[PDB]
């Protein structure tokens, strides 16, 4: 970690950002008529995405803290300060929302009673993988409708997401391969 870690923290913030926005879109559906089993699934999905966001945010802080204690300068940019403030704010927000979801989940569970706690899993990685392609496909079809810049950002968001999947600090070879190749078509398009 060099005298400037800004670009690293910047890349981590983009990853946290797209994870957070995905969590938020789930969350907003939670906030009359909504079936319990669907309310529950949405709540879990939203929770796992906040937790993943929290993992990426925490790693940012971990990196920045290590850098701060090791680098003798103590020279920080305005930018890094700003991003670190955004990280802290977002970590507080994600954590409050994840607590709220944990609670709501617990409450919902106390209105049921199971002979299948032999029972299904929600995999955060599948959530991320599917959504990433739904974004790109929505954009390609929007591209066919006319909105050049929205197709850029949409496309951008898809690749940050797949990159999180391949990242070893934030966590199958057939799958990783499948992903290792998937960034390229999206990068080609964008």
């Amino acid at each position: 970690s060099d005298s400037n870690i800004t670009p690293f923290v910047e890349s981590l913030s983009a990853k946290a950002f797209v994870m957070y926005s995905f969590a938020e879109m789930k969350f907003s559906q939670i906030l009359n008529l909504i079936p319990a089993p669907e309310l529950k699934k949405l709540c879990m999905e939203s929770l796992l995405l906040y937790l993943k966001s929290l993992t990426i945010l925490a790693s940012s802080m971990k990196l920045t803290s290590k850098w701060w204690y090791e680098n003798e300068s103590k020279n920080c940019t305005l930018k890094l300060n700003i991003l670190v403030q955004w990280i802290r704010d977002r970590f507080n927000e994600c954590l409050d929302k994840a607590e709220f979801l944990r609670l709501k989940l617990h409450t919902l569970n106390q209105s049921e009673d199971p002979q299948v706690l032999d029972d299904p899993t929600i995999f955060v990685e599948k959530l991320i993988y599917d959504r990433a392609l739904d974004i790109s496909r929505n954009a390609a079809r929007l591209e066919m409708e006319g909105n050049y810049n929205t197709c850029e950002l949409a496309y951008a968001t898809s690749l940050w997401m797949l990159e999180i999947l391949l990242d070893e600090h934030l966590s199958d070879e057939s799958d990783k391969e499948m992903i290792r190749k998937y960034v390229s078509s999206i990068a080609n398009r964008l």
Binding site: L51, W68, F91, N92, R102
Partner: protein, 47 residues
Amino acid sequence: LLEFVKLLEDKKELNMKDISSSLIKFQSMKPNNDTLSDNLSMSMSID
């Protein structure tokens, strides 16, 4: 453009072969997050 729509339409799924405690570790970081941000700001000032 169509190759792209097709590939995305044609996607295959992944094959995958705590929460409580994770939240406690995160909650535990909160003071450290403040201190760090504050340490970064304090360095920005000559005096």
